[model samples]
Target chain A: GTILIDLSPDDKEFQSVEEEMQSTVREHRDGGHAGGIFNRYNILKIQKVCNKKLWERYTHRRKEVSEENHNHANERMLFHGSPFVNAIIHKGFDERHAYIGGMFGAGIYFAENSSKSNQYVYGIGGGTGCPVHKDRSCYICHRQLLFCRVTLGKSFLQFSAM
Target chain B: AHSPPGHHSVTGRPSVNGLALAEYVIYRGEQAYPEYLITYQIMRPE
Candidate 1:
């Protein structure tokens, strides 16, 4: 059942999410050709109550869990001019089933030649876990970029998830 | 050469190559893979 929560459009949590998305878009736009790569960052806060025994039992047991089932996955496709220039994926865990987690993405763009042709490069690549019991949260950072000539047209079109 | 009406060429400058625009749409489960399509016009100045 989908329960609708009746609230004002200015709800605090919704506001925060809107602000975050706007800020991210602005940052990307300002990054321009130099900051052409896609970069993403994220932080997770998990709070749970468990006994020491349970903690110890799950500490190593969690390692057996498949990496794909852990929590989150991200995919991004960047379009330059009209061509899909890059596609990226950031997975939460690795093949060893280790608990690796963090935010990930790429940078913007940079000039490569005298013609002002910009080349984007991928930076920070991967990340992993941070144990809260150890007083830390996992952080992930990633960056990647590709270069292609984009001719700005008089008009363009974009469709997004509604 | 005489300039064409509403068109002129600049030395070492490329002609207007295309247009830039964006369109967005939301889709339910039964939509196509592209879900929505956007098209633009690219042109070269004479």
Candidate 2:
């Protein structure tokens, strides 16, 4: 099933982007890995899409947009992704066609999934996406979290009792 | 039904009470947590 070209900007994928973005920011406060075209859409300012002054604008205007969580230092950044701004790659010409999926500072690759079928799974250390809520310190990508019965590979910053 | 915590069942709200912020705020989330309507599981101080 082909995932129809909806106006939604694939939030699941961005969870991966956040990791890469964090890694990028963690390494170079002012720079990150060249996260391919999909990332380019997210990083490039929506207003200046066709201009191609890629290095001029700041990370698709990415910022610390977050909502604080109760009794925790959890803050979730709102994803203003490619669609809402009318800059969904080449004025809506491209969508994940550039490349998608990867961790912090990791290179992206072209991958597609059926519109509504199959629950993709990899090793105790592989994943395409996961149904994660706004950052409550999602500690994915850790072997220690095995007892939680989560076979899906994901990452988290922290976690306490909900 | 339409009463569930953290469930977005409707569209738009006057405020999200800082549930959303900055970028995901304005049009969609700039400062949203858009409290349309939810059925919160409450047990108040038992």
Candidate 3:
């Protein structure tokens, strides 16, 4: 099962994530992308807590594929904001509902720039409804964004639609 | 059309009238693991 753990405001990881968000927005604004500016509110660490077998499968596949392709497990943490965040945490990142279709075809898309990912964070009532249990402090009316560790084993570079 | 043959992911580079930012795409859902989630308020300009 997936668990969202809230990080205290003063926690080191919380501070780092906040700083990264602020800096990313500033960089995007400076680069002429005039959107995605926001005020920090809350930060939560997503952990698939109770599925040891599944977790191992993921970790193993990540290494296996990357090593086989000689990419040295070329994994990176990237930005991915979406209205389906609730669904994502519950079921993982599904490419079927990922931005419909794009130049890279149907796939789970991640952005290098936070603002770029921020562009997709559009929905009412906390991005596809907040999970039950008020004790977790589910955000009811704010934009939700995900920072994901994505495995990019032997990436195929493309500039245009195929 | 999945990541060609040997490639596990697709990278869309920034281009004029194309991708505005560097975009990474994975055909498989397992290729991504959500690490952190942040909820924030939109700052309005005065």
Candidate 4:
């Protein structure tokens, strides 16, 4: 089941995520590119407890690769943008369903910079009687962005396309 | 600590000819958990 809790725009966490998105756009956006011009419309806290054990087990096994010396699994919060928002939120990330040609190999792709993920952030509909953001540029209005917790255990660094 | 016997995830660094930001890739889905969904809009300059 999908448990999406609405978060207040004033919430600190919400503000932090929004700021991250904004700053990334501001820093990385190219000339004439208006990716920085954006406002957060809504935020949904996707809470699921089923993956806790799996994640914990994975983290524990990563202890050997924990260069932190404090037994940290190199866990990080990353962003994933996609058009199939509801599908991913409902069933979680499945690499088999992942699209090909992500520069890296076939897997669940995530980005530390929000601007990178912003490229994939797409909107649904904008015609008459549309659900949200039914105005002129409705397509680019209600875009979906996923904030994920990724366990980068024993990471392999790739500088160029393989 | 010694490096692990096998790599579990992949990280792509930014490059002029390639990626613009650091990208993280995990082979398994369980390695990642979705925690939040943010809906945003592009601010149009008038």
Using Cα atoms, each model's DockQ against the true complex is: 0.02, 0.03, 0.49, 0.44
Best by TM-score: 3
Residue B37 lDDT in model 4?
79
TM-score of 3: 0.74
Candidate 3: segments with Cα more than 4 A from true spot = A26-54, A96-98, A123-140, A160-162, B17-20
Worst 10 residues of 3 chain A by lDDT: A129-138
Selected candidate, larger DockQ, 1 vs 4: 4
Q: Model 1: how large is the Cα RMSD against the reference?
A: 24.2
Q: Pick the candidate with the highest lDDT.
A: 3
Highest DockQ: which candidate?
3
Q: Which 10 successive residues of model 1 chain B have the least lDDT summed?
A: B27-36
Going through the candidates in order, what is chain B's TM-score? 0.19, 0.16, 0.72, 0.67
The CAPRI-style docking tier of model 1 reads: incorrect
lDDT of 4 by residue, A116-155 (tens): 5765654211123123543433434456678887878778
Off by over 4 Å in 1: A26-66, A69-162, B1-46
**B1-46 per-residue lDDT for model 1 (tens digits):** 2112221111111123122112111111011011001111111113
- All candidates' TM-scores? 0.16, 0.17, 0.74, 0.70
Tens-place lDDT per residue, model 1, A74-158, is 1111121111212211111112321122111111211112111111222111112112322112122222222211111111122
Candidate 1 Cα lDDT to native: 0.20
- Candidate 2 docks at the CAPRI level of incorrect
